[PDB]
């Protein structure tokens, strides 16, 4: 059965609700982004209308085989009517293709569903500026003040400088970057660009990147691992065993690996500046965990919500415990008393 925080009252619509079978009364299923917790249940046998971005549409067609007749892509920043209701898709600053959805209900209520997002001041000059929002369905992944991390630009600066230094000291070092989903592509793309290399990967991961509308992609990536000195590997292989095993396969081309594991937040954030991050090292293998987040920090979330001033907030993450729900409700009430809405 479909929970309440995935239904849009007064419409036939759901959001990110494909794991419950046929939802009673649902005439249109919205997909915010192509992350497995959110698409859970879609396949080539799905026969209802799916509304989403162009990029999410390319991934449902080519990776999940959903038939073309049921894929409904919408452009961003554009007023659209779906089954009698005005909707707008906005960039969520999450992974490629990810959106927030503005719904203009027939009774005059306006609802924003953030999907997954990384709040930014630039969102204060989208189509959100123009009018009031009564209900906010909010990505609360990091809704507690301990959750701090740097900007994506500082993190990428660190990774570029680390890789360029190492390969300039040792032209025989290989760089490896872990992945398990779409998102965070800037980590491996910026490193390969400083090194003057394409990024090497499996046929399956190449397929996924080819769906993403990245300009000049054919100039940036390849399936020919032998010619490339930046390789992608599944995240589960980013450990001393998996990496040893990978260097053997390269046939004595390389004598050192430097690897990156993008994570979300970890507790080493609470004591260490990005500058001061150090790897784990065994022999000729070094592994850096870097806090590249595609979700809002506490401070970014708080700024967005204090600016939007919604009448009601419905969290969509961390909803499973009484303590989580109570904690989030306390912070929504401080934010509201501090800003005066
Ligand atoms: Ni996500």
Task: Please give the structural blueprint.
Elements: E1 7-8, E2 13-15, E3 28-30, H1 36-39, E4 50-52, H2 54-64, E5 71-73, E6 80-82, E7 85-91, E8 99-104, E9 110-113, E10 135-138, H3 152-169, E11 173-179, H4 185-195, E12 199-200, H5 203-210, E13 221-222, E14 230-234, H6 240-249, E15 256-263, E16 280-282, E17 285-291, H7 298-308, E18 312-315, H8 322-339
Parallel strand pairs: 2-3, 3-4, 4-5, 9-10, 10-18, 11-14, 11-15, 12-13, 12-14, 15-17
Antiparallel strand pairs: 1-2, 6-7, 7-8, 8-9, 16-17
Helix pairs in contact: 3-4
PDB class: hydrolase
Keywords: SGC - Diamond I04-1 fragment screening, XChemExplorer
Assembly: monomeric
Structure description:
The strands form three sheets. A seven-stranded mixed β-sheet has the order 13-12-14-11-15-17-16, sandwiched between helices. Strands 6-7-8-9-10-18 form a six-stranded mixed β-sheet. The chain has eight helices and 18 strands. The chain is globular, with a radius of gyration of 22 Å. The longest helix has 18 residues, at 152-169. It has two domains: 1-147 and 296-341, Metallo-beta-lactamase, Chain A (4-Layer Sandwich); 148-295, Rossmann fold. It has 341 residues and is of the alpha/beta class. The chain starts with 6 loop residues before the first strand and ends with a helix. Bound molecules: nickel (II) ion. Nickel (II) ion is lined by residues 33, 35, 94, 116. Nickel (II) ion binds at residues 33, 35, 94, 116. This is DNA cross-link repair 1A protein. One of its GO terms (molecular function) is beta-lactamase activity. Keywords: Cell cycle, Cell division, DNA damage, DNA repair, Hydrolase, Isopeptide bond, Metal-binding, Mitosis, Nucleus, Phosphoprotein, Ubl conjugation, Zinc, Zinc-finger. Its main location: nucleus. Binds constitutively to TP53BP1. Binds CDC27, which is itself a component of the anaphase promoting complex (APC). Binds PIAS1.
């Amino acid at each position: 059965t479909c929970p309440f925080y995935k239904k849009i009252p007064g419409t036939g619509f759901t959001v990110d609700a494909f794991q419950y079978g046929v939802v009673e009364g649902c005439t249109a299923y919205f997909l915010t982004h192509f992350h497995s917790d959110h698409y859970a249940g879609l396949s080539k046998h799905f026969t209802f209308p799916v509304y989403c971005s162009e990029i999410t549409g390319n991934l449902l067609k080519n990776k999940l085989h959903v038939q073309e007749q049921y894929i409904h892509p919408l452009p961003l920043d554009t007023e659209c009517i779906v089954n009698g209701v005005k909707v707008v898709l906005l960039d969520a600053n999450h992974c490629p293709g990810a959106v927030m959805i503005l719904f203009y209900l027939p009774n005059g209520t306006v609802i924003l569903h953030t999907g997954d997002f990384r709040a930014d001041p630039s969102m204060e000059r989208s189509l959100l500026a123009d009018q009031k929002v009564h209900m906010l369905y909010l990505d609360t992944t990091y809704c507690s003040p301990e959750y701090t991390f740097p900007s994506q630009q500082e993190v990428i600066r660190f990774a570029i400088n680390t890789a360029f230094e190492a390969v300039t000291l040792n032209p025989h070092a290989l760089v490896v970057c872990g992945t398990y989903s779409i998102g965070k592509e800037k980590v491996f793309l910026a490193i390969a660009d400083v090194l003057g290399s394409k990024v090497g990967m499996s046929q399956e991961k190449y397929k996924t990147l080819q769906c993403l509308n990245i300009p000049e992609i054919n100039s940036l990536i390849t399936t020919d691992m032998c010619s490339s000195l930046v390789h992608l590997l599944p995240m589960m292989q980013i450990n001393f065993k998996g990496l040893q095993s990978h260097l053997k396969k390269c046939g004595g081309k390389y004598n050192q690996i430097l690897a990156f594991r993008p994570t979300g937040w970890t507790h080493s954030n609470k004591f260490t500046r990005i500058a001061d991050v150090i790897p784990q090292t065994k022999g000729n293998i070094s592994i850096y965990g870097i806090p590249y987040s595609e979700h809002s920090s506490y401070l970014e979330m708080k700024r967005f919500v204090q600016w939007l001033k919604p009448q009601k907030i419905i969290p969509t993450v961390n909803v499973g415990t009484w303590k989580s729900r109570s904690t989030m409700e306390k912070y929504f009430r401080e934010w509201k008393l501090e800003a005066g809405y």
